[PDB]
Every structure is written in structure tokens, then in C-alpha cells.
Design a protein around this ligand. Structure first.
Ligand SMILES: O=C(O)CCCCN(CCc1ccccc1OCc1ccc(-c2ccc(Oc3ccccc3)cc2)cc1)Cc1ccc(C(=O)O)cc1
Ligand SMILES: O=C(O)CCCCN(CCc1ccccc1OCc1ccc(-c2ccc(Oc3ccccc3)cc2)cc1)Cc1ccc(C(=O)O)cc1
Lengths: 182, 182
């Protein structure tokens, strides 16, 4: 994933737990070698998994719980590290943001085109709910999509209730969520 | 489940969608030979599952979305139909209520002893966070638990984010929810 992602992880860990524990996690992930992540440089995904795996053990916290907190962190982080305009442009509400999300990734994709953005389809079931289809080149990131959704809820002061109803991990085509909101 | 569960589904659908829709759903579930549900009578679980499945078809919403809606409704419904005091006795906050739930079900299990209550274990990860282990003799009600949690937040006027972290239906031992609450 682009370096922005690993910079975001390094940021929330060292914000919440301390620079000491971050370098610990970094050591454990076998990533003591590299000095600082480069935001616009593409990395191989393992660097992210190993950081999340390594953070799980150092913090004695389940990985999915870390992916959840990271998903939520990402929404605020990106607003403040050069992407608040791009965020604001994806829209005014949770349903609209999700509809624009493929378009937003298309924009980001142009900037540096080694981006492999996930696909999000919405089937609105009412004025207050939807079924979200999350299609990814990457495995494991459903818990992060949950956090992302609660991040957007915070962003729009919208209460969100999300339950995962299909599971890529099992061999199903793709993750699916049912969502209810304010 | 005890008939109160099916009366609550009936009430919810009737209130939200009308009695014309309720009948079609009861018809669709193939339960027209049931004139009225009896609250203190133990029914086959299948009756619940069929109403949820058939309501899903009629309303054109995923079962899991209705289960969330239903979990939220249950908190209010039981408050107003004879279990207000029982509910009150289980505490003045979300962490307390959840901690008392195993005892709330003990007292429900003298009225009547054929209750199959789920077990809820809380690991409090801070004063604003819990890991909730939900263990059930039933399948597929995790989304209802999610709704129940949001119902309690409403009840105690507390902001609450629930994220499921482990899923019984994929073959994990029991559902696990991560919960932040203000
Ligand atoms: O399943 C997957 O493959 C990844 C899932 C989680 C990742 N994000 C989640 C999307 C999301 C969902 C809800 C709410 C907000 C979301 O994202 C907002 C966002 C995401 C990415 C960027 C971004 C910005 C610059 C990037 O890199 C650049 C930019 C300019 C020039 C060079 C590189 C890369 C991503 C900005 C805002 C977005 C994302 C992040 C990284 C990549 C990637 O490296 O392929 C692809 C997508
Ligand atoms: O996993 C499962 O197997 C079921 C998940 C969802 C069900 N509820 C969840 C409990 C709950 C969770 C969060 C917040 C509040 C909750 O419950 C409040 C409550 C629950 C049940 C009753 C209740 C009252 C009367 C009952 O039945 C009677 C009453 C009098 C005489 C004879 C039967 C049964 C349940 C009242 C308040 C409660 C429940 C309802 C029915 C049964 C059962 O039929 O076995 C078991 C439990």
C-alpha cells in the first residue's frame, strides 16, 4: 500500500501509546531497517500486515481491534495530511460519501497510478439503510472497513450500525455489510 | 423462542409497515394458522427465523438489517409490555446492564424455565470500552445483539459504537463485539 497508510499507522500508535512502543512494534515487524515511510511511495502490503501483526502482539490487542481503530483514525488523519479537500468533495453524508468513493479513488488513482483501490457498491434499502458490497485486491481489511464506517459517522454526526453478512475470508466472492444510520 | 419474541416482531412490523404487510409476512412465513402469538408459550425457533426470512422478502431488506432494527425495538417493547421494572432493575448504564444480563436471564428463567438464555461476558478494556463475548444456543442473531446494544445506548442516552470482531457463523467459537461508549 502507499506509504501514507504506514505513516498513518505509525502516527496513531505513537500518538496513543508512545514513540517507545512504536519503535518496539517496528522492530518486531522486522522493519527497523527503514527510517521513515515515504507517503507517495508504494510499499508491499506485507509491511502493513506485519505492522498490524506486530502491533497486535506488542499491544496485546487483537489485530481486528487494531484494524478497527485504524479505519476510524484514517478518516481524521487524511483530512489533516493533505486530503481534507478531497474528503470534503466526496460529500455531505454517509450515503453520498459511499456513492462517491469509487470516484474519489479514481481521482487519487491519477495522482500516482500504482493505486489499487477497492470497489464499493451501495444498494440503498431505505432512506436510512443500505447493503454495502466491498470488493478488494487485499485480504483481511474488513475490520478496517468497519472502523472507516464509524469514522464517517463521526465526520457527519451520523449514528452507524454495521454488521458483516458475507465474508471474503471464507471464500465467498466479497465482503458484504448491512448498514443502518441516523 | 418464547412467544413474546414473535409478538414483538409482529408489533414492530405492524407499527412500522401496517397490518396489511404483517399479514402478508405471516402468510409468507406459512404461519397463517397462528391467529395470535402467546407470550408465555415456548415456540419453535423456526417460527422466528421464518418471520424474519419472510419479512425480508416482503419488505425487500436483508434479514440482518431487520434483526438490528428488531434488537433496538426489543429494548423499548419490553419496557412497555410488562418488563419495565425488570429492565430497570438491571442498571443505570450500558456496562452495568450488560454485566447484569446473565442475572436478568436467571430471573426471567422462573418465568418460564424453558428459556434458553445466551451468555454475555464483558472484558472492560477501559471505562469507555468493552470486549463482549456473546455465546448462544441460537445461530444468526448477532445482528440483533448489535441492535440490542444500540437500544441500550438510546435507553441510557449514551453514544455507542459496536463492531463485531469474531463471528460464530464462520465457525469461530462465539461472536465477539468490540464496544466504545461515552
Ligand atoms: O481494500 C483495500 O484494498 C484497501 C482498503 C482501505 C484503504 N482505504 C479505504 C477507503 C476509504 C473508505 C472509507 C472512507 C475513506 C476511505 O479512504 C479515503 C482516502 C483513501 C486514500 C487516500 C489516498 C491518498 C493518497 C494516496 O497516495 C498518493 C496520492 C497522490 C500522489 C501519490 C500517491 C493514496 C491514498 C486518500 C483518502 C483507501 C486506500 C488506501 C490505499 C490504497 C492503495 O495503496 O492501493 C488503496 C485504497
Ligand atoms: O441468543 C439468543 O438465544 C437470543 C438473543 C436475543 C434474545 N434476547 C436478548 C436479551 C437482551 C440482550 C440485550 C439487552 C436486553 C435483553 O433482554 C431484555 C429482556 C429479555 C427477555 C425478556 C423476557 C421476558 C419474558 C420471557 O418469557 C416468559 C415470561 C413470563 C412467563 C413465561 C415466559 C422471556 C424473555 C425480558 C427482557 C432475550 C431472550 C429472549 C427469548 C429467549 C428464549 O426464548 O429462549 C432467550 C433470550
Amino acid at each position: 500500500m502507499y506509504g501514507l497508510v504506514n505513516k498513518a499507522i505509525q502516527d496513531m500508535i505513537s500518538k496513543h501509546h508512545g514513540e517507545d512502543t512504536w519503535e518496539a512494534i517496528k522492530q518486531k515487524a522486522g522493519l527497523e531497517d527503514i527510517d521513515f515511510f515515504v507517503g507517495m511511495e508504494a510499499y508491499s502490503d506485507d509491511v502493513t500486515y506485519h505492522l498490524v501483526g506486530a502491533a497486535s502482539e506488542v499491544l496485546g490487542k487483537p489485530a481486528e481491534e487494531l484494524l478497527i481503530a485504524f479505519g476510524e483514525y484514517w478518516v481524521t488523519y487524511t483530512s489533516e495530511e493533505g486530503y481534507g479537500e478531497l474528503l470534503a468533495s466526496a460529500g455531505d453524508s454517509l450515503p453520498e460519501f459511499m456513492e462517491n468513493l469509487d470516484n474519489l479513488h479514481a481521482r487519487v488513482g491519477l495522482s500516482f497510478p500504482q493505486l489499487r483501490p477497492p470497489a464499493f457498491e451501495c444498494q440503498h434499502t431505505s432512506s436510512k439503510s443500505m447493503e454495502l458490497h466491498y470488493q478488494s485486491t487485499r485480504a483481511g481489511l474488513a475490520p478496517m472497513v468497519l472502523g472507516l464506517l464509524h469514522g464517517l459517522g463521526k465526520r457527519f454526526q451520523t449514528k452507524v450500525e454495521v454488521t458483516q453478512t458475507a465474508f471474503r475470508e471464507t471464500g465467498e466472492d466479497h465482503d458484504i455489510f448491512s448498514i443502518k444510520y441516523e
